[model samples]
Target: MNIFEMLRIDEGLRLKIYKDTEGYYTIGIGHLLTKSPSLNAAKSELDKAIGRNTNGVITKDEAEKLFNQDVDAAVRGILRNAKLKPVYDSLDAVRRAALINMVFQMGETGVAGFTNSLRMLQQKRWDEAAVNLAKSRWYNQTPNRAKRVITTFRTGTWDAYKXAXX
Candidate 1:
């Protein structure tokens, strides 16, 4: 399993806040709860990681950062899939970013399991690939984001979700 898959298994996906084994407040995978401004370095790190301006509680910016980081890693993980290599290589940066975003929200292996979608992409069947993407659990769970991404995949255009590094 790739590191992304391992992290999902190890941390387990959590969309809501819950107490950890030690009773620490946690959310979004395994992010521990804490007050803001514990220290300059800590705050700075959080700011850099998630663009937090204050100290207490996790913000949406922080969560977005976490997702982006996971997406970055997932991009590398997907490249390890031989079945996806050619299709991945054939995509433009925008479509590649969309794929990485999908892999980030869905697990790397989960996205890779879309054999027909991958094959459609390999054949440059943009419309068919988008249709296949819409037929997945990911699309069902996140229709809005899926729509944006599927559009990108079909047209190879960067939407509002482009990475800072890209």
Candidate 2:
């Protein structure tokens, strides 16, 4: 079983996170980890930073310890050539990755709602595509993430969406 399943992350926490990390975290997703002396808060924070959706919540210290592991997995999922090739073929690397991150955030069905936007992407109508992408309920629901990606696609540089390098 995946770590998230083992950890029992709640939907509320998930949505909260996507709301919290809109700018600080590079994944372009928002997440607000609880602040506490316990390990769960830390784990939650680290998980958000490194792209782990859920795992049994732990203290901030425990999360920090696992930070590297989480980062490795997240980057692997994104950077693996085989994983990225098909997406790259269908969309530019930036757009594809942004969509994938959204999928990671909300799931395939949520990302799939962008069918119209994808068509616009294929037509190279970036502005229209961004508008279409922004039309989804998810966009209104998660304003920060939607704006970040829309800006990335429209401007052609998702630099703000990138994870910070240490």
Candidate 3:
């Protein structure tokens, strides 16, 4: 199964916007609709098509397909970007996956904003990259997740970043 399918199964399909276990407004297979600019934009665009309402519903298959499309675009955006392509290609599968995850979480422009980190990555400076990643505002916001990515960069392990593994 693909990453979308795995995430769908793990998160479960919600279909309609409802308060998730954490009391956050969520819809369409765990698309959390708060404080996430990308997801908010996604919800807005989807709302334009389907009409935003509590009555709105989407199928499990549809949500999985949507998620897959989003993931594909994010992956493509990262791989095709001139500035990122060389460094991305130079990394192992695990590091590449971690970078993709970073792009997915922060958008291409957001990830690109990490100039020092990207520079370190391009130079194959794993320790420097880890330090740069740990020092970013992204790290301050999500320390645990950031640690996992930093560890992956430092050790070149797939244990923490495994979305691309099958």
Best by TM-score: 3
lDDT per residue, candidate 2, 50-91, as tens digits?
A: 566555334444443443344344445544544333443677
Residues 37-142, candidate 1, lDDT per residue (tens digit)?
Answer: 2445444554455554645346555564565565567778888877666778987776776676666655678788889998898888999999888998878876
Instruction: Superpose all Cα atoms of candidate 3 onto the true structure and report the RMSD in Å to 1 decimal.
Output: 6.3
How do the predictions measure up, each by TM-score? Answer: 0.58, 0.48, 0.68
Tell me how far the alpha carbon of residue 149 in candidate 3 is from the true structure, in angstroms, after superposition.
2.2
Clashing residue pairs in candidate 1, if any? 36-55, 36-56, 37-55
* Model 2 lowest lDDT segment of ten: 5-14
Root-mean-square deviation (CA) per prediction: 10.2, 10.7, 6.3
lDDT of 2: 0.51
- For candidate 3, lDDT tens digit of each residue in 1-166? 2334334434456666556665666666556555443545546655654554324466666566556666787689887787777778888876786777677566788887788888898888999999878888889987866787677778777555345322
Best-to-worst lDDT order: 3, 1, 2
Q: Give the range of the ten consecutive residues with the poorest summed lDDT in model 3.
A: 1-10
Model 2 earns a TM-score of 0.48
Error of 2 at 144 (Å): 1.2
